């Protein structure tokens, strides 16, 4: 149970992640991210972005976007 | 059909496919830790006199190159007898391309009919050459030469006058199809006398070569440098491994020569270009047995390493960094090939008898009842007083 807890305790957040108020790697698939971890390029709890090619099945707080960046050509980032 | 040509580029090795055949052997110095040798003398075999062979035949270089992940084709002729078919089988299993191998039903592999004179001093004057001396110009596989990006050959193919003309024809055709010409000297035993004969014999092929590899002993012989360093002395003094200045090898230079490689075994490899020159230190403390003592496996491994590097980056033939890397890669290939051959062949104890190195390093029990290391009866004891 301790091994799973340590494994899934994610990244440090907020004032525990940055000394100062701020006023990460992108991986194409999960195997590239795990391979970078094996080569000691990232740590077990270092945050990363994962390209997701399935449906949106991530358990998360039911919240609206923090920010929407809306380009005048029609693309928007939530 | 150049759209069907793959990577790495094909290399055509031209000449003879012999079995454990050595052209020559010269006294040599190798880098060695002599403190270790004294400590391990009772367990590590060493020759009384260190004599190194330049390498083997064109067939062995093809086999060594195929072992490095290269693409090698062997161009030659074998007889249709059982020995010729066994050698063809050995080349195919080693993944050497043998579509450039001509099988001769009329000639015999590894056998020549000589006419020995019984009048004055003994002479031989070959009459009917062996199968691997009878490749004709009509039998050259031009398709292989079209695909191949490098053409490799050695002096053994210049010894027979009929074989020499075929080698010259193959070289000239390969130059036309834009192949790099790699000339590996490997000077055969008769040529080591009468330097003037050697120069006349190799002069034409020498000027057509883009890359040349010689041993340090061969370079000294062609340059008229009499060996002045010591041999078989327990030190690694730098006079045994001297990097000759470029002007010392300038008389051998010609207009189209790109690189000259000078080998001192896996101990040291020197390189010379028009602009650059240098040397790379190696390692020659490999396991050696009486069956592998001439170090010909290293020479084939070294040349195969040079060929492999030069063919995959052919535009880097003058980059000094790539040349240093190429020389170090050749040293490693020679070391591994020598190391493997000791394991395969083993030690002396087709009736051929060999033992492993574990058996070679196993001592006798010293349990002789008369001997001083066992428990005698109470009669003959001589209890040593303390």
């Amino acid at each position: 149970l301790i091994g799973l807890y340590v494994l899934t305790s994610g990244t440090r957040r907020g004032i525990c992640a940055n000394r100062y108020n701020p006023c990460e790697p992108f991986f194409c698939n999960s195997y590239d991210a795990i391979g970078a971890y094996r080569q000691k390029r990232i740590n077990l709890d270092s945050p990363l972005w994962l390209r997701w090619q399935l449906d949106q099945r991530v358990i998360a707080s039911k919240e609206v976007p923090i920010e929407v960046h809306y380009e005048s050509f029609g693309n928007y980032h939530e | 059909i150049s759209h069907t040509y793959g990577w790495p580029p094909l290399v055509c090795c031209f000449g003879s496919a012999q079995h454990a055949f050595v052209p020559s052997g010269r006294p040599a110095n190798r880098l060695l830790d002599y403190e270790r040798q004294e400590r391990m003398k009772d367990a590590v075999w060493a020759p009384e006199k260190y004599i190194r062979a330049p390498g083997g035949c064109a067939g062995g270089v093809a086999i060594a190159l195929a072992s490095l992940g290269g693409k090698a084709a062997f161009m030659g002729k074998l007889g249709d007898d059982d020995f010729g078919q066994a050698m063809l089988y050995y080349l195919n299993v080693c993944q050497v391309q043998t579509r450039s191998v001509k099988i001769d039903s009329k000639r015999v592999t590894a056998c020549s009919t000589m006419k020995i004179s019984k009048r004055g001093r003994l002479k031989s004057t070959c009459v009917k050459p062996c199968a691997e001396d009878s490749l004709s110009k009509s039998e050259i596989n031009v398709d292989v030469l079209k695909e191949a990006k490098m053409f490799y050959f050695t002096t053994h193919s210049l010894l027979d006058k009929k074989m020499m003309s075929t080698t010259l024809q193959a070289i000239k055709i390969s130059k036309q199809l834009g192949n790099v010409i790699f000339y590996d000297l490997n000077l055969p035993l008769p040529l080591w006398q009468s330097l003037e004969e050697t120069k006349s014999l190799i002069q034409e092929v020498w000027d057509l070569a883009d890359v040349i590899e010689v041993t340090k002993q061969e370079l000294e012989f062609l340059c008229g440098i009499e060996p002045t360093e010591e041999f078989d002395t327990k030190n690694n003094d730098s006079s045994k491994f001297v990097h000759y200045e470029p002007e010392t090898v300038e008389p051998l230079w010609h207009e189209n020569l790109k690189i000259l490689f000078v080998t001192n075994g896996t101990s040291k490899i020197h390189y010379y270009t028009k602009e650059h020159n240098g040397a790379v230190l190696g390692m020659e403390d490999v396991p050696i047995t009486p069956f592998t003592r001439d170090m010909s496996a290293s020479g084939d491994g070294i040349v195969a390493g040079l060929i492999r590097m030069l063919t995959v980056q052919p535009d880097l033939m003058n980059d000094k960094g790539y040349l240093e890397r190429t020389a170090r890669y050749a040293i490693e290939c020679g070391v591994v090939d020598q190391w493997l051959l000791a394991q395969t062949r083993g030690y002396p104890p087709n009736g051929i008898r060999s033992i492993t190195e574990r058996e070679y390093r196993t001592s006798k029990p010293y349990d002789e009842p008369d001997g001083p290391y066992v428990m005698k009866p109470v009669e003959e004891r001589e209890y040593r007083k303390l």
Partner: protein
Amino acid sequence: LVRKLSAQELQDLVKGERKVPLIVDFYATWCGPCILMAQELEMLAVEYESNAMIVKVDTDDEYEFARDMQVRGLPTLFFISPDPSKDAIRTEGLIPLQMMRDIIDNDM
């Protein structure tokens, strides 16, 4: 037994006459395959006890005679017939025993 000979001993042995084929094994001490060839030749010498004679010449000692015999490398065997009209056979490299038996019977 395989006997070591000089160039003058071999000249006296070739110019003379014999009733069995003569095998001359050019060798050197520094050559690994020549040691393996020595093992094959002593097995052959036992098979053909008196039916043949096997001799060896050190090419380092006799480089003049090795060259005049057109030895181009090592190992090298000469199979010399006792019939003067028959021609000798030069083999190069480590050849299997059956080839030597074939040479001795079929053409020597």
